Amino acid sequence: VDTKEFLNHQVANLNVFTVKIHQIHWYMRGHNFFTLHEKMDDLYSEFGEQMDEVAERLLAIGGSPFSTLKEFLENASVEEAPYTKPKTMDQLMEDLVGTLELLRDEYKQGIELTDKEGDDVTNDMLIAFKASIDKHIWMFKAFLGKAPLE
Amino acid sequence: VDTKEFLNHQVANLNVFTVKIHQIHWYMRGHNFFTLHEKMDDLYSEFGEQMDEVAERLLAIGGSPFSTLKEFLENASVEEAPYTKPKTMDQLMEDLVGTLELLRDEYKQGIELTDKEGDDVTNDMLIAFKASIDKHIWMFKAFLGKAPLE
Amino acid sequence: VDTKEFLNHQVANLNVFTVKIHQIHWYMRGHNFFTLHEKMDDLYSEFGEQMDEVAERLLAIGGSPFSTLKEFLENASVEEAPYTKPKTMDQLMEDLVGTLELLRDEYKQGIELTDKEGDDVTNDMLIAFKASIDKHIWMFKAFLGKAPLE
Amino acid sequence: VDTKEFLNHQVANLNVFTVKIHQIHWYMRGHNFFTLHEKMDDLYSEFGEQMDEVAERLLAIGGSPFSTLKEFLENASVEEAPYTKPKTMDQLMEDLVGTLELLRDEYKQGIELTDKEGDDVTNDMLIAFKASIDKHIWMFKAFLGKAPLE
Amino acid sequence: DTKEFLNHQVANLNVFTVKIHQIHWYMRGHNFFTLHEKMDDLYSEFGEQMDEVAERLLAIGGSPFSTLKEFLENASVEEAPYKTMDQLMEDLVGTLELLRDEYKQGIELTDKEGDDVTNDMLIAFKASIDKHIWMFKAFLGKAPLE
Amino acid sequence: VDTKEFLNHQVANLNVFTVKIHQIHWYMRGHNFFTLHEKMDDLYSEFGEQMDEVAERLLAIGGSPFSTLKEFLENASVEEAPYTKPKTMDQLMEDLVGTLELLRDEYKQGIELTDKEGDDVTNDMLIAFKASIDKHIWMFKAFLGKAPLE
Amino acid sequence: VDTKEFLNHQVANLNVFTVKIHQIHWYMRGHNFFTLHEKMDDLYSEFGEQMDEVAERLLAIGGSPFSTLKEFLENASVEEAPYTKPKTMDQLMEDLVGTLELLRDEYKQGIELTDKEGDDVTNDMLIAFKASIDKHIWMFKAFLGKAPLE
Amino acid sequence: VDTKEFLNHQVANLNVFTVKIHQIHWYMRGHNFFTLHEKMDDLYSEFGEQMDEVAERLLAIGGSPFSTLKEFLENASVEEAPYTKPKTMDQLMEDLVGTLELLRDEYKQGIELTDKEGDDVTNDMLIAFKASIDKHIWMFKAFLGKAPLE
Amino acid sequence: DTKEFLNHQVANLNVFTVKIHQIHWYMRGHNFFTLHEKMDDLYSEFGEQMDEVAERLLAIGGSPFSTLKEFLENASVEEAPYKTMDQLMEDLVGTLELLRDEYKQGIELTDKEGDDVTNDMLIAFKASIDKHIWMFKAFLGKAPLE
Amino acid sequence: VDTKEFLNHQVANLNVFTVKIHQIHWYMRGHNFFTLHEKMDDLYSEFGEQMDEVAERLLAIGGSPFSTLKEFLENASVEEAPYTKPKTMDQLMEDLVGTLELLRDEYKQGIELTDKEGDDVTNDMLIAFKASIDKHIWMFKAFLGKAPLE
Amino acid sequence: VDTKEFLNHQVANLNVFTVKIHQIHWYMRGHNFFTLHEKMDDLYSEFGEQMDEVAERLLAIGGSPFSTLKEFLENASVEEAPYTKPKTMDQLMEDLVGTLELLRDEYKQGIELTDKEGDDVTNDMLIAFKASIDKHIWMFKAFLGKAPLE
Amino acid sequence: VDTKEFLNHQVANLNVFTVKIHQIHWYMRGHNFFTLHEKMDDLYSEFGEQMDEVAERLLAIGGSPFSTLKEFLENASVEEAPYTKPKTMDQLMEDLVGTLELLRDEYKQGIELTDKEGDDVTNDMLIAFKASIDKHIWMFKAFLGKAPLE
Ligand SMILES: [Zn+2]
Ligand SMILES: [Zn+2]
Ligand SMILES: [Zn+2]
Ligand SMILES: [Zn+2]
Ligand SMILES: [Zn+2]
Ligand SMILES: [Zn+2]
Ligand SMILES: [Zn+2]
Ligand SMILES: [Zn+2]
Ligand SMILES: [Zn+2]
Ligand SMILES: [Zn+2]
Ligand SMILES: [Zn+2]
Ligand SMILES: [Zn+2]
Ligand SMILES: [Zn+2]
Ligand SMILES: [Zn+2]
Ligand SMILES: [Zn+2]
Ligand SMILES: [Zn+2]
Ligand SMILES: [Zn+2]
Ligand SMILES: [Zn+2]
Ligand SMILES: [Zn+2]
Ligand SMILES: [Zn+2]
Ligand SMILES: [Zn+2]
Ligand SMILES: [Zn+2]
Ligand SMILES: [Zn+2]
Ligand SMILES: [Zn+2]
Numbered sequence A, B, C, D, F, G, H, J, K, L: 001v002d003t004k005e006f007l008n009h010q011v012a013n014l015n016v017f018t019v020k021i022h023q024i025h026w027y028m029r030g031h032n033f034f035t036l037h038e039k040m041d042d043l044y045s046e047f048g049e050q051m052d053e054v055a056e057r058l059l060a061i062g063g064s065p066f067s068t069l070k071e072f073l074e075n076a077s078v079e080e081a082p083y084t085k086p087k088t089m090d091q092l093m094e095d096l097v098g099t100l101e102l103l104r105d106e107y108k109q110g111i112e113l114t115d116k117e118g119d120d121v122t123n124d125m126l127i128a129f130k131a132s133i134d135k136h137i138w139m140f141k142a143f144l145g146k147a148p149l150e
Numbered sequence E, I: 001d002t003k004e005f006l007n008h009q010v011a012n013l014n015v016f017t018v019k020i021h022q023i024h025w026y027m028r029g030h031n032f033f034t035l036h037e038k039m040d041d042l043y044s045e046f047g048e049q050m051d052e053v054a055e056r057l058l059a060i061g062g063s064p065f066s067t068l069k070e071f072l073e074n075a076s077v078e079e080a081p082y083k084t085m086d087q088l089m090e091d092l093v094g095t096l097e098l099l100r101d102e103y104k105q106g107i108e109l110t111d112k113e114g115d116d117v118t119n120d121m122l123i124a125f126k127a128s129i130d131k132h133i134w135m136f137k138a139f140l141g142k143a144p145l146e
């Protein structure tokens, strides 16, 4: 696992994540619909923005990003499930928080990986993305009544 | 085929299309890079909004939109191919124009389907989208040196 | 019933609706106050704009719009009730959804009526209004925990 | 009358006034149409905003605003008349000026009423509204060729 | 057919926008400042309708007229070299009524051929024309259909 | 007491209040987190603006505002408590509403006091602040399910 | 007459003109009030900027601009009259057009004066101002029913 | 001296004041030129704005504002002197501060005068203007090293 | 005289803006997106020059041409019904060079008559035309005066 | 010590700093008043933003920020003094530069400390803050006539 | 010397000037730092824009602009000196005014030269640039306590 | 080389680079003129901003930036050549890409240099600049038909 492979892995993860954001965006119900419906729009834009930046950083270091839905499913560690039985707002947010923690930890791995290879630019890019993920984790856990690391 | 499934089919198509737009966005090379790189950014946003609007119109009439990459692959008539053999700007644009022509013709069907079923809102929505698709087809063919219906 | 009578009927309906929106805007209580208070401001503007458009389309086809509260009360199928006992947030939203469903179904009548009479502009105007009403119905039902047509 | 009843009386007055502004907005004819048509939109917005502010100030002091067309008609001292016989621009403006003068004098009463009851906030709110009304009175009388207090 | 109708309107709208400039330039009277600015608004709107019509024609395989020569030969809209404000506005309302009625023909013409996009485009344009007809007739003291 | 002494007292009150707003802003949890997190930022800015205006009005009449945390603690009638055991959104909001009610009542004193000594500028300033405070009291009590007075 | 004095003369003229613009702004009556009231606001601003620019161009070439009302009255060729006998909109506009024609002709002289003296900057500045004056003369004459050079 | 005469007196004062602001704007020299040159532009706009509002309030209560430079000089208590010998930045600012204190005290008189006549609107207008004058007095005295009331 | 020159340009610019639309509509090739948008910019700029010229003519006592009829009869700018990108751009550069040289005549013509405002107006327009001439010639691979 | 303990220490420092900024903002006098009065508003906003970001970063890693003036005084290494005897702009600025140098040196500690414990997000955040602090130190020392270090 | 040679000469002058503006921008110290630091940014943009315009006007008339630092040094009449000893704010401003006076006088030559050659566009371009230079000369001399031509 | 000398070396490099960007901006010809002409303006602004940031960071750590064309030529490793023989768009872009690669590699050296000297702020600044340079390298090589590291 080198920097190129790690970045391509995150390209796949983020494409699975943004579609999951749309899933929550579409199917949510409950008293918090209006607040959290718009909030998902914000997350979709932000993480869609991360995905393009990760892909273009991969391009800038000589890599070739995955560019099909097939490649995303086959390579993503982020998990998706179709929407079958109705779910509560808390359950949807727990799926979202779980995926955010996944991305956080994988970004932690990439940060160390890039420190190893001497890739300072990619290192700095991932740190900034992780800062936002940590903030979202605190906020969405606070929504669930929990502490960030609980 | 009824209105609900047609809309869901396009939800799948548009998700494959936007990823194809990113593919062209990322891998394009040649003298026209800067113009078409930015042009792909515009198309990605516009068709991302068509996808969200179609999904939410489907929700509004009692449907349940596909919300996973797995469901998109199984249901999309738009075809994708990983990027292995380096393609020219003309070939990437010819692939793009092909998918636009595909979506136009499929929307052409949906418009008749919805006029028959008496769904006036979904009918008008599809016409507005087709108007934009027809304009893009003309413009990208002109870029390729071709006439719109060639 | 002809096109002029239908549009004038909706002029009365929409004036009753916007005042009902103000009632909910003013008297609402509960944990969702801040979100739904602001949301009611948005609805007030949108349907006040529909009302002005309907009246001016009526003017444009030779009609004479109702222009007094007296005429609005006498002609509106939308029903209003003074605010005496404290209602819950859910009860206000159920009244709002009910009135939206009323306007949706009556607009459906106008759409068929205007298609028959060959009034293409008014037909398209009513379809656009219905598109928005259907979206609001989906969103507010989701807030109540219910499906759009349930 | 106490402060709560006075404010509620004005809630009814302003709802009748804004509908009257729309009446002039819709039915006006003559060479001054384009200027005064747009001018009525400005007045509609401003006095619609006055109405919301009055109602919410009433809410802030423990009151319960009228929230139906029925209650507005029953309580308003402002008079409305259906539009049956054609009227001139000057006659419409003279109807508008009369209502502005009505609101001014009633606001002056409320200003003295609120000074007596020691409601300093409501006192200041009504003074600011009167400032704008006095300016409109000067301008529309000047339009009519008259002095402000003529 | 649709191509012939759209190209016909390209000629009409080019004659119309020049007529709008004519009113814009020559008007006099107490309503000068309001209607002078109003004509700029109409010039932009109908100049934009013209561009949309021409490019819709392009999008369906047509070739729009693109010279003053071609506009004069094909336009049903009438122009006259160079009035009171009322005379200019009645010339304007007449052309708006002309364009409205001709658009009605195109709407039914396109409904037949199954061109829903061009159909929808013409309806939206007619909506604006009907609104202008009401407002300018009201300026003249008249009812919309009078 | 006099006007100078009153304004300096509120400078201390408002500095304690804004830090309390940050406390609620930071520690809040529950389903209403996203709405009320943003709302606290708005309150922080508005009451931060009141504090600067009060201090600069005190300067304008020859006074000397307190300008240290030491002086604020010594002079503020608003009470603060460190955050040891967790509390709900409702308890935080009831603490917030309590402090707003305090400021409302103390401003009522200043409004009569300043009109009394003939300080018309400071009188008008305090009325405008109370107008906003009364509105916040109404809105946040409505959030709590209560009437303004309750 | 040299460049410095000509500029100072116009400093006096423009200060008298803007006050005359306010006079028309304040006292105008008739059906055209709203349009011309706002139009006077535009003229006041534009000619206030001409005055400041002329004064600062005078400063830049070593001059000393008049800076008191006393100096303006003694040096201005533009004439003012207090408002006693009620004037019509036409008469106020005819007074305005007269002063514009005055300024045009005096600037006409300054342009030749500065071309002779070789002051290219001041020459170009006066031409730009005259361009605006000529346009206003045409527009206000058209308002009066007249041709520009009538 | 009644409200009408007082307002007309201030119309004259402010026209003398704004020309004085231009005098300072034009002739100032020293290290503080760039900061204070722009600051005078701000004061010119603000007090020019006060003048129009005062004049139009006079119009709204039946008065007739002075509208010539002649009337301003003859009625103004604000004093002007042509610019002869060079002056320091401190001296120019002391002339400005002196005039501000003059306007403040005269506005104090008008506030009491309007309280007497029961003119609540004009009373409120003058208080707001005085608030700004008091702030400028503090700031410009601070520039001179002095306290506001020193 | 000045009136005759300005009215002549009213006809020229109306033919020019329609030619700009012609290029805007019919262009094809790899530069489509850039030059399609560029033509919209030129249409606005020269449409604005046309309005300024007509209203300056009005301001000095003239009467601007206001019909397609009058434009064709008086315009020295040439139009042809409907190319490669190079052919369209060379047609555009030619008209820009035409307008430049004719404006030079008006500048000296107005200097004589002592019309400094119209003189200054034409100079500012020529400044923009010269810049466009450089840029479009560079696009064609050529030097500005080549 | 560790990262949590460091961030909470700076929360206390920054709360003392912003009140000190207000102190300088309020009491400053001299020829540079207008420039530095505005500059202090900018500093108040920026360092107010640093405080919120530090507190929310502390929350994101599981910490609990101090949230009372009591806790701020007890923990801040930044020193405050009430304003008894007058001081110059230079002495106020030297107090400001001193506190900035303090924050610079303490942030240097945190930057090495957080890189050490592997907190990459907090490390990057503190570097960005120090970048701005170093710039402020350079600029304000240049104002004082001194070199940055010195 | 012809038009092409003059414009190219100014291309070299302006590139030396903008770097000199940066020198003052970077090294300045003293109480006026914040105002004049920002002012230098404004000058840098304006004269960088003049430089681009001059070069592109040279291109437009068939010329070939200098495009290297080597060519700029070889051709510039504007003089530069490395920064060794600390200069005062006044000394930097005296160097700036000196260079402005140089550009003013040389532009005067170009204005006469281009009037003779019949290059009306370049003539007008240079006049506009001189208008700005003359204003800067007035303002910066006033900062130094001197008259514009002294 | 230490940090101060490295930053000063880049001050010289960037001034040579921006002038080179202008050279390409001015002399370019071919079908890609309009896109790349505007693109050079963007690059001119960005790297002009990099230059100011580098110089001011050098100032913040006690350094003295080069501030003359003489000093830039003497210290720059970036090479410039006058434009005598015509060049193609590709050759101009290849000159641009070469300089970008130069700056990247030299910035990488500075990044390691600053990590060694413990200058965390300057380290982060150079990393961010390198991120942008790497992106430009990918895009302009793609324009040339090549891979980023080819
Ligand atoms: Zn991208
Ligand atoms: Zn870093
Ligand atoms: Zn090519
Ligand atoms: Zn990109
Ligand atoms: Zn993208
Ligand atoms: Zn959505
Ligand atoms: Zn949505
Ligand atoms: Zn509200
Ligand atoms: Zn309306
Ligand atoms: Zn009339
Ligand atoms: Zn309307
Ligand atoms: Zn409200
Ligand atoms: Zn009239
Ligand atoms: Zn177009
Ligand atoms: Zn287009
Ligand atoms: Zn339709
Ligand atoms: Zn439609
Ligand atoms: Zn936050
Ligand atoms: Zn402040
Ligand atoms: Zn009072
Ligand atoms: Zn007030
Ligand atoms: Zn009339
Ligand atoms: Zn006004
Ligand atoms: Zn005014």
Ligand SMILES: [Zn+2]
Residues within 6 Å of the ligand: G052, G056, H025, H041
């Ligand atoms: Zn000025």
Ligand SMILES: [Zn+2]
Residues within 6 Å of the ligand: G056
């Ligand atoms: Zn100035």
Ligand SMILES: [Zn+2]
Residues within 6 Å of the ligand: G025, G041, H052, H056
């Ligand atoms: Zn006014």
Ligand SMILES: [Zn+2]
Residues within 6 Å of the ligand: D124, D127, F124, H124
């Ligand atoms: Zn008051």
Ligand SMILES: [Zn+2]
Residues within 6 Å of the ligand: B031, I030, I031, L031
């Ligand atoms: Zn090509």
Ligand SMILES: [Zn+2]
Residues within 6 Å of the ligand: E024, E040, I051, I055
């Ligand atoms: Zn015009």
Ligand SMILES: [Zn+2]
Residues within 6 Å of the ligand: E036, I055
């Ligand atoms: Zn015009």
Ligand SMILES: [Zn+2]
Residues within 6 Å of the ligand: G124, I120, I123, K124
């Ligand atoms: Zn000139």
Ligand SMILES: [Zn+2]
Residues within 6 Å of the ligand: G124, G128, I120, I124, K124
């Ligand atoms: Zn000019």
Ligand SMILES: [Zn+2]
Residues within 6 Å of the ligand: F056, J037
């Ligand atoms: Zn302040």
Ligand SMILES: [Zn+2]
Residues within 6 Å of the ligand: F025, F041, J052, J056
């Ligand atoms: Zn926050």
Ligand SMILES: [Zn+2]
Residues within 6 Å of the ligand: A123, J115, J120
């Ligand atoms: Zn690191």
Ligand SMILES: [Zn+2]
Residues within 6 Å of the ligand: A124, J124, L124
């Ligand atoms: Zn960083």
Ligand SMILES: [Zn+2]
Residues within 6 Å of the ligand: K037, L056
């Ligand atoms: Zn700076």
Ligand SMILES: [Zn+2]
Residues within 6 Å of the ligand: K052, K056, L025
């Ligand atoms: Zn350029």
Ligand SMILES: [Zn+2]
Residues within 6 Å of the ligand: I030, L031, L032
């Ligand atoms: Zn090519």
